Amino acid sequence: AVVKCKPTSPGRRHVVKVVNPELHKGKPFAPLLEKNSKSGGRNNNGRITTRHIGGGHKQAYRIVDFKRNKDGIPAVVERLEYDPNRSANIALVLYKDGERRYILAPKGLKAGDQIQSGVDAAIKPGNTLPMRNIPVGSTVHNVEMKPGKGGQLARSAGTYVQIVARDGAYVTLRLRSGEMRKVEADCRATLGEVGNAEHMLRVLGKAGAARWRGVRPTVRGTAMNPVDHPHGGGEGRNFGKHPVTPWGVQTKGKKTRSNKRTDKFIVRRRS
Amino acid sequence: MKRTFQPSVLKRNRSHGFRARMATKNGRQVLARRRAKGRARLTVSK
Amino acid sequence: MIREERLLKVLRAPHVSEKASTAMEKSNTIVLKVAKDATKAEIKAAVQKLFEVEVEVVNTLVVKGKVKRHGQRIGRRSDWKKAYVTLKEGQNL
RNA sequence: AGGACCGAACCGACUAAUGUUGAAAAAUUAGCGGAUGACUUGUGGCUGGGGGUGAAAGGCCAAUCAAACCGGGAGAUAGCU
RNA sequence: GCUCGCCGGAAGACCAAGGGUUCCUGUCCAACGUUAAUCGGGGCAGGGUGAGUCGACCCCUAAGGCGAGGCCGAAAGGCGUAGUCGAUGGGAAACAGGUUAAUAUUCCUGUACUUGGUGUUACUGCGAAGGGGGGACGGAGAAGGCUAUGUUGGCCGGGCGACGGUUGUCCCGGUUUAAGCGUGUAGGCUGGUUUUCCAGGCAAAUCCGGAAAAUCAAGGCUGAGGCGUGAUGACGAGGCACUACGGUGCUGAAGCAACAAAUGCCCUGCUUCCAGGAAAAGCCUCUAAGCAUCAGGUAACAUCAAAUCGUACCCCAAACCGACACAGGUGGUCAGGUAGAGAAUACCAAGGCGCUUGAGAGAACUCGGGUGAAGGAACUAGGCAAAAUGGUGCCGUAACUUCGGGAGAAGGCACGCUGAUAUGUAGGUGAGGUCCCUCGCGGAUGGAGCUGAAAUCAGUCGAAGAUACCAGCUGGCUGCAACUGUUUAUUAAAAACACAGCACUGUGCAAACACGAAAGUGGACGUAUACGGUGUGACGCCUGCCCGGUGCCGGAAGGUUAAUU
Ligand SMILES: [Mg+2]
Ligand SMILES: [Mg+2]
Ligand SMILES: [Mg+2]
Ligand SMILES: [Mg+2]
Ligand SMILES: [Mg+2]
Ligand SMILES: [Mg+2]
Ligand SMILES: [Mg+2]
Ligand SMILES: [Mg+2]
Ligand SMILES: [Mg+2]
Ligand SMILES: [Mg+2]
Ligand SMILES: [Mg+2]
Ligand SMILES: [Mg+2]
Ligand SMILES: [Mg+2]
Ligand SMILES: [Mg+2]
Ligand SMILES: [Mg+2]
Ligand SMILES: [Mg+2]
Ligand SMILES: [Mg+2]
Ligand SMILES: [Mg+2]
Ligand SMILES: [Mg+2]
Ligand SMILES: [Mg+2]
Ligand SMILES: [Mg+2]
Ligand SMILES: [Mg+2]
Ligand SMILES: [Mg+2]
Ligand SMILES: [Mg+2]
Ligand SMILES: [Mg+2]
Ligand SMILES: [Mg+2]
Ligand SMILES: [Mg+2]
Ligand SMILES: [Mg+2]
Ligand SMILES: [Mg+2]
Ligand SMILES: [Mg+2]
Ligand SMILES: [Mg+2]
Ligand SMILES: [Mg+2]
Ligand SMILES: [Mg+2]
Ligand SMILES: [Mg+2]
Ligand SMILES: [Mg+2]
Ligand SMILES: [Mg+2]
Ligand SMILES: [Mg+2]
Ligand SMILES: [Mg+2]
Ligand SMILES: [Mg+2]
Ligand SMILES: [Mg+2]
Ligand SMILES: [Mg+2]
Ligand SMILES: [Mg+2]
Ligand SMILES: [Mg+2]
Ligand SMILES: [Mg+2]
Ligand SMILES: [Mg+2]
Ligand SMILES: [Mg+2]
Ligand SMILES: [Mg+2]
Ligand SMILES: [Mg+2]
Ligand SMILES: [Mg+2]
Ligand SMILES: [Mg+2]
Ligand SMILES: [Mg+2]
Ligand SMILES: [Mg+2]
């Protein structure tokens, strides 16, 4: 649900939050949790390499099954759960042999729903099959790029991929960005759309909500001095320059892809 | 007013101590320079 | 068993002071200057052998030497170890 | 419930007077802002000099910053005093 | 020594950091001490720091550091695996009283507790670098049950008052006791047990997880406090006796109850929210290889062991950081009375101080304050500064508005004390006692004692009753920025930065991008509802025309054009 907050204070006036009453209210499943500590955007030289990262709430890591290779064994969803690490919700499924795993929660999946993976799984939301067993035109997510590597595409909340054609050992996919991509038919995919499509409807409402997520303020290049940024300097507000990154590369339209190794697998760029 | 020197013996030893100097070649050259000069106190350790 | 050459080295002197005399009079405790590395077990064994009395308990402490001056020259006295050796109520040393 | 309200600790530094060979190389007195939060604070750690870090003032990096400090080239050069 | 003044959420007491003998005693007064000094944190000499339980050490890991091999790099070196370090976090155990000139949870008295080694008794499947459990975790909020602690009464000891009264409803003092051990309560959580099967838990498992039945519902786990005991003890007002008048020798009553009550405890609870909240070991439990009457484990009995280092003293400071005995700075803990919402404030208690130059005088002028006729912003760049407002309840409150606000708008009334309603009310607490019980720390009833607002009526004093301290000035028009935040440490706090929101643009994952000669690493254990860059800056109504110049994006026939040949 998408509910607007009443304006009892200036920081609350514009807040729009997503309330999903179905989510588990207790703690996560402990055997599948992990520590991950924060980087502040610093690499192993101790240098900031991605700006605007730091602070935020402590987060535990949930081990999610992106491979979905437990073939031929049905499982039952016990509960949906909040995952601080990603936009999508996650589902704790219990396998009939007594094993528990987390999966990305497909749209419309809920407690009690049965799921399965394998070449003989039914074509229903939540089931993972090799894409040479999924009909052309289907809506899939958690798509593999290399067989057995694990799902890598269409993982974010509300995302999905369309199988548009099958040609030999490769399938053509329409990605969320509009790109048409080839990938081997033996790559796996989960049927349906990633759930929590209302995620994009939230409004943080104030600076503090972004600070809670570990996002640090962005200082505009034009507010700096010339020593700091190519946009820096000027008496009053002045620009008179072609807009560039802090490292001086044009940032309004210049293409930066250079991967000849993978150029073959792209059919039509998102363009 | 808070001043620049705020003593901590642990920080002192970890940053200037004998074993800190012995750990790198440039710290060992610091030690060689101080022995050649004849310093009675090689490091902050003593 | 601790060798007797060790035992002959660990005791250095009786300690004389108002506290030491009061300790001996009120708690049957002798106060001794002992070697720096002398443990409580060595002190007890040495008092039981060299002075052939019964020891109940040894308490020890390290005295840190003072900074002193000898003609504007800074000096420091050595650190030394003190033992409070409590005798067994009829040992009377 | 709230980067919600009033207000001590705590954090800050808007005004004035004093002080200016000071009680102080930035304070004191009266007033002043925030005070459950983008809050405050202890301990330890990481980032190093054309480099770091910066809710950006060319700010800060040991009372030193439009290129730290120490040693070296080194008695640089000085049509100037 | 007697008076006076000052602090008392500190200017008292205690930890950690840092310092290192500054601690105690004797002696000395050159220098040091902003004066003198007989004094001192000064000189000189001597003395002082006592641990199985406090801390370190130790076991365990976080960030991070190092890193056998390894990968990478002219050399030096970089990164990193197995490992090994690293607290600011997790892991065994002691309390009360007495004592020194100076130490004490360390000494002494009394009373406890923990871990481990070895020897005997009985029973016996033990065994890990492996598995599972546990440890183990957020913010906010609300309330009940308590304790610390305080107040009164009772009890006991003392008093009968320098000047009117004070044998009483008078006054002063005390009225303290721990860890441990037994009890298992207010409360919190959870259904229990017994069989059989199973694609999971790097192998196996009686353990965990899953499935299926039988059968029973009170079983288990956790838990403040109280009670008993510890305790015939210690302590104890005071009193007796000496002094080397600093204190010691001896003796020692009462030692209860009610009420109030924490920010401490139950509570790592409960309720609720999103921003979704360490790790590892100690510990429990399962087995692998292995040994298999051995070992090894289970409890009991004895006995041994608990080493080493620190321990003085200062610690919001004259002993730490500030060149100083310097109006500065410095983390944590304790938390009495009267008033008060209060840790504000005023006066005090315990306790600690009067700040290391004084004596006079009573000019100008300077500093910090008090008061001021008449006027009342005429001052001035400007009401700068000052003056003023200031509490609680109630009445009442406009434009506008994003419907929350604006608002404490504005403005106004009441307020002390005494008596009555009621010798103390509403309300809280609730004994003795009785009724009963699945049996105790028990459920119903009853209400004595205790405690207690607030109102109304009537009276009463003063110029004045929110009387001190404390404690909003208010309204009207308008520029800028939406707002809370941030900033030029040390002349600028703002209209500057940020911001939620908006848009463009890059980016298909070995992503773009960034640090790195590289290996790698951040982006991200993320995957286009994502991530980077840029500009704009809540919201509302909107965002017109120009692609000639520069840039970017696409095209690739034609001219021109490198190395090469
Ligand atoms: Mg950014
Ligand atoms: Mg932005
Ligand atoms: Mg600027
Ligand atoms: Mg430039
Ligand atoms: Mg201009
Ligand atoms: Mg122009
Ligand atoms: Mg002892
Ligand atoms: Mg000791
Ligand atoms: Mg606020
Ligand atoms: Mg500041
Ligand atoms: Mg002030
Ligand atoms: Mg305000
Ligand atoms: Mg306030
Ligand atoms: Mg400038
Ligand atoms: Mg500086
Ligand atoms: Mg330069
Ligand atoms: Mg030269
Ligand atoms: Mg020269
Ligand atoms: Mg001295
Ligand atoms: Mg002294
Ligand atoms: Mg003098
Ligand atoms: Mg002295
Ligand atoms: Mg590590
Ligand atoms: Mg390394
Ligand atoms: Mg090597
Ligand atoms: Mg270790
Ligand atoms: Mg620690
Ligand atoms: Mg003392
Ligand atoms: Mg009580
Ligand atoms: Mg002490
Ligand atoms: Mg002084
Ligand atoms: Mg001072
Ligand atoms: Mg006060
Ligand atoms: Mg005068
Ligand atoms: Mg005057
Ligand atoms: Mg006045
Ligand atoms: Mg007068
Ligand atoms: Mg006047
Ligand atoms: Mg007048
Ligand atoms: Mg007037
Ligand atoms: Mg005028
Ligand atoms: Mg005028
Ligand atoms: Mg003013
Ligand atoms: Mg005033
Ligand atoms: Mg104007
Ligand atoms: Mg603003
Ligand atoms: Mg502000
Ligand atoms: Mg300034
Ligand atoms: Mg300023
Ligand atoms: Mg990578
Ligand atoms: Mg702007
Ligand atoms: Mg604007």
Author numbering:
A (entry chain c): 2 to 272
B (entry chain 1): 1 to 46
C (entry chain s): 1 to 93
The authors write:
Ribosomes are ribonucleoprotein complexes that carry out protein synthesis through the translation of genetic information into polypeptides. The ribosome consists of a large subunit (LSU), which contains the catalytic peptidyl transferase center (PTC) and the small subunit where messenger RNA (mRNA) is decoded. For proper tRNA substrate positioning to occur, the tRNA anticodon must base pair with the mRNA in the small subunit decoding site while the tRNA 3′-CCA nucleotides interact with the A loop, an RNA hairpin in the ribosomal RNA (rRNA) of the large subunit. U2554 forms a non-canonical base pair with C74 of the A-site tRNA and the base of U2555 stacks with C74 (12).
To probe the structural effects of the A loop mutants, we solved the cryo-EM structure of the CC mutant 70S ribosome in a complex with mRNA and aminoacyl-tRNAs in the P site and A site (non-hydrolysable Met-tRNAfMet) to a global resolution of 2.2 Å. The structure reveals that, in the presence of the U to C mutations at positions 2554 and 2555, the A loop fold is indistinguishable from the WT A loop. In addition, the A loop in the CC mutant also contains the proper 2′-O-methylation of U2552, as evidenced by clear density for the 2′-O-methyl group on the ribose of U2552. While the structure of the A loop itself is not altered by the CC mutations, the positioning of the A-site tRNA and its interaction with the A loop is altered in two ways compared to WT ribosomes. First, C74 of the A-site tRNA adopts a syn conformation, in contrast to the anti-conformation observed in the WT ribosome. In the CC mutant ribosome, hydrogen bonding between N4 of C74 and the O2 of C2554 is preserved with a syn-C74. Despite this change, the C75-G2553 base pair is preserved and A76 and the linked methionine are in their canonical positions. The second A-site tRNA class identified in the cryo-EM data (class 2) lacks density for most of the tRNA acceptor stem (including the 3′-CCA) but contains density for the anticodon and weak density for the rest of the tRNA. The structure of the WT ribosome used for comparison contains the same tRNAs in the P-site and A-site as in the CC ribosome structure, and both structures used paromomycin to favor A-site tRNA binding, which facilitates the direct comparison. These results suggest that the U to C mutations in the A loop interfere with docking of the A-site tRNA’s 3′-CCA end, possibly due to the syn-C74 conformation favored by the mutation. Grafting U to C mutations at positions 2554 and 2555 in E. coli 23S rRNA stabilizes the 50S ribosomal subunit from thermal inactivation, consistent with CC variation serving a stabilizing role in certain hyperthermophilic Archaea.
